[PDB]
Structure formats: C-alpha cells, structure tokens
Design a protein around this nucleic acid. Structure first.
Length: 83
DNA sequence: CCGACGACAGATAATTTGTCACTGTACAGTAGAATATAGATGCGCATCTATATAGATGCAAATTGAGTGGCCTTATTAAATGACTTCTCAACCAGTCA
C-alpha cells in the first residue's frame, strides 16, 4: 500500500525500502515467536528474492508474538459481535 | 470349489455454512436539458353577399273648368211711363164813348 505499507495480523507494517513497490504483490516470512520484524520477498520465476525487512507500527515496544496478535484480534472481534 | 452380486455396517471427502483477515473503490458541484418538428386552437382583418330601401318616372282614371253647338209667332188699335224733333213767342194807329 502507498508509502511501502503491508497489513499482517491486523497490524500495519512499514517496509524500510518498500515504497517503490506500491500496488505490487509480494510474499512474506515471519518467525511466530516475534512478528515485529517481517521479511518481504518478490516472487519471480520459480524463486523468491529478499526485498526488505519491514517493521510493525503503533504497537508497544515489547516484542509481539504471533499468538498474542491473534489474541488481540479475537478479543476485538468478540467486542464487535457483543456491541 | 470358484466367481459374482446384494445387505448391513463403517469410514470419508464434497457441499454448505460460518468465521476471520485483507482489500478495491466511491465520497469527492452536476444530466435534466436543448432543439427541432407537427397539429390544433384562437383573435384579427379583409372580402364579399343579401336586404332594404326612398326618390324618380311612367301611366291611367277622375274629375274640372272651359268652351261650342242646337232649338225658338206675328201684325194692327188704344192707354200708361220714359225720351226726341218741329213751330210759335209784333207794337200804335184808327174808330167809339162817358
């Protein structure tokens, strides 16, 4: 998205050098223990090329695990269904 | 004895439904409006028509005044009245008488 943003687990990620690829599709890889930095790849002829690191925005400093981001999302969905 | 088909039971992905996360896209002053036409209706102005004449003229009775034409006893006498005409109208000398 414009400015080099990606959306993963309802968080917004800003790529370090990603803004030249706005409107392009990319693929991405993450360690479930810490999703605060995500690794973005261009898909190509039978091969993925590493493009940038990307960082989570608007979250707390403490490192965010994948299950914790699901937890925040399902708690928020439960409030929406309640209200 | 060997092979094929049906009953009953058991396990399984396709189908449908639900939930969840990421996303393309509209919100951005804006199509009711412009421009022909036919077709019917109404007001105005002209262009006839048909009726209505009173004045003038011709004519034909109806007197109306003004003409014209046709038909008629007469002679004597007398009186009366009214007229006309004619004629006439000297002057002194000579012879008686109381």
């Amino acid at each position: 998205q414009r400015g080099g943003c990606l959306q993963f687990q309802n968080l917004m990620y800003r790529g370090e050098y990603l803004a030249g690829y706005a409107g392009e599709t990319v693929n991405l890889r993450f360690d479930p223990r810490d999703i605060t930095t995500i690794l973005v790849y261009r898909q190509e002829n039978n091969q993925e090329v590493f493009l940038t690191r990307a960082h989570a925005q608007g979250l707390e400093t403490e490192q965010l695990a994948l299950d914790e981001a699901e937890a925040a999302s399902r708690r928020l969905r439960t409030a929406g269904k309640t209200i």
